[model samples]
Target chain A: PVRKAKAVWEGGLRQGKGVMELQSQAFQGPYSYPSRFEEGEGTNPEELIAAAHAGCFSMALAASLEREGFPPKRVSTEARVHLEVVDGKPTLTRIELLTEAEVPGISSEKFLEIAEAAKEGCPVSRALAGVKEVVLTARLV
Target chain B: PVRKAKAVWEGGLRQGKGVMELQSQAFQGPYSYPSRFEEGEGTNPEELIAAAHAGCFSMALAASLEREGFPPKRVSTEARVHLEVVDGKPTLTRIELLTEAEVPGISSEKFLEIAEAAKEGCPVSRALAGVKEVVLTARLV
Candidate 1:
């Protein structure tokens, strides 16, 4: 809803171009890039997006499950991406998200609902709608 | 044709929850954490793939252009992806790479041909066939 993050690209595409990572001064919350991945260190937006997607989805699903009184024992996401040249144009054609979890006392159907809710509510999903849409295939294993 | 580079992924995906970082002894390159991203400190495969694709595509394009005696002035690529849940199972659905280039003195038809060649001949493209694939949109700018 707000400018959670922002960035700037300096220099050309190649030639060791640089991207000045953006940190919105607006809100201090889940999306902030911690000290672990900083300019003086290493890490980029793509990795951040992956981490955020994984972290946010798990937490959101866990919270949703708790709300429905079906807390999970564990949840994990494995995000794999596909890069390709479509119509003679380079584009990321796919992103696959795998989530395995253990939900105590929850029916498969209920678990699915929670997973879907988590996917729909995760901040990354909304943030990525325009940037790059996703087709998440989340399920309990 | 060769092991152009290598990478490693230590630690779990939970942001330093035990990430050891990956490296490729092939290139003697350190798995710089913050360099790969802004959130983690490790050498993940995707980032390596990005670097490879970018390098291979650029060189292939340049060689193709010079072969025709019409070198490109610039070339850039932005890799886009999707992370989603499909069929109640999560998977990486797409990898979109949008590349822009300035090839002087080439007809649109020939430019498209060169682009096609690069897409197929680029080492990364061949290696990427294991995943879903697309194309490098050619523009004679």
Candidate 2:
């Protein structure tokens, strides 16, 4: 299936503002240079990426844990996206996913292993495999 | 710097629903198996990916054109993300970016060249380089 998103920008790059909208009307927001590269008050692409990765990984982890005979009571995840200048261009260097799960009767060690595997198996992580690195940490709580 | 997003999932993957939130509070939405793999209510990771890609590409193109002394009157871009089942798992396979621009005094050829360069330079594209393909079409209008 093909999902669509649209963006519109007006004026010069630094002076311009853009609006991003998902075709499904899930969300829409504004973005600009400040929002992207500085401390600003709007949405940026990187943050959206972070949200997508977190959403996908959390679901995948829940599935993995369930298949292993320990259905999680809850799976929560946070994704941090790191952006830096590389080779004189802005580069998305790495992503770190921190996850915590409530899975009764599962060893901490086993939970961590399953979490690692889920990170690798998530659709978003696989799509972004070209990134420099994806580091993940899992804790059973 | 690191930008963060969070997700919370309840129950198993197929039977569960997830909520996605960006740290900046730019947007928040829900996701599930039906919403992701099929046409259903709420949001999906793929739509968010498309939004990020389109947003980033539009900004990069504006920057590129401005640097070339041809500021854009407007730049509109649509990103389509293709998802398919691969290896028994749903996977993001490709992306197609369709863009149209209005730049006074710039030839169509020049605009296309700049658009291509912008696609390569966009941070989101770099992050998603793992996707099997990223095809772009730039039309001067």
Candidate 3:
């Protein structure tokens, strides 16, 4: 399937503002300079990337666990995306994924194994290899 | 710096639901099999990626023009992300970026050059090279 989104910007770089519209009409909002470089009142690209990564990872982990017949009661991931000034331009440096799963019949070792596989297997994680690095920590509770 | 987002999933993958959260609390919403693979409610990752790419490309285009002494009156970008089921896993296959700008003193040729450079230089575009292809069409209006 093909998923889509659009953005419209007006004015100068620093003074301009834009709105992002997701295909599902799930999100329609503003994104601007302050939203990107500093604390401001709108959604920025990095935050959205983080949300996407986290969402993808969480689902991947759940899928992995289920396939192994050790279904999780809960699976959660916190995706931290790092952006920095690389050669005077903003660049995505790294992503750190912290994941936790609650499974009744799994050992910590087995859980970590499954989590690692999910990290490597998730489509988002695979597509993001272009970033400098991706690090992760997984836990079972 | 660091930006974070979270996701939580409960139960099996296809039967489960997940919620995505942005660090600044700018966004908090749900995502799932139906929302992602089919037409359903809430947001999905591909759309968020498109928004981020479009937003970043627009700003980068404006910045490039300004640096070239041809500051834009406006720069707009619409990014379309394509997701496909590759080998039974959803994959980000390609991206199409269409941009238009209103820069008073720049020629179409110069604007196209700068816009191409912006696409190559933009952080989001660079990070998304993992996608098989990125096609761009830029115009000065």
lDDT of 3 by residue, A1-141 (tens): 566677777767787787776666556668778877776778778888888898898888898889999878999899988888776878899999999889879899989988887887766677777798888899987
Please, what are the lDDT tens digits per residue for candidate 1 over residues A44-126?
33333344445445555666776787666666565543444454744444445667667777788888877776776543444
lDDT (10s digit) by residue, model 2, range B9-113: 988878889989875665678899899998988888898899999999988898899999999999999999999988697889989999999988898888988
DockQ-better candidate, 1 vs 3: 3
- For each candidate in the order shown, give its overall lDDT on alpha carbons: 0.45, 0.87, 0.82
Candidate 3: tens digits of C-alpha lDDT, residues B1-141: 787889898988788998887746456678889988887887788878888888888878888888898888877678888888886877898889988788998888888888887878867887776788889999887
Alpha-carbon runs more than 4 Å astray in model 1: A1-141, B1-44, B85-90
Whichever of 1 and 2 has more lDDT, that candidate is 2
Q: What is the DockQ of each candidate?
A: 0.04, 0.83, 0.71
Ranking by TM-score: 2, 3, 1
Q: What share of the true interface contacts does candidate 2 keep?
A: 0.87
The true-structure Cα RMSD of candidate 1 reads 12.7
Residue B11 of model 2 has an lDDT of 87
Worst 10 residues of 1 chain A by lDDT: A27-36
Looking at candidate 1 chain B, the ten consecutive residues that score lowest on lDDT are B1-10
Clashing pairs in 3: none
- Which prediction has the highest TM-score against the true structure? 2
> TM-scores for chain A, candidates in order?
0.62, 0.94, 0.93
Stronger candidate by lDDT (1 vs 3): 3
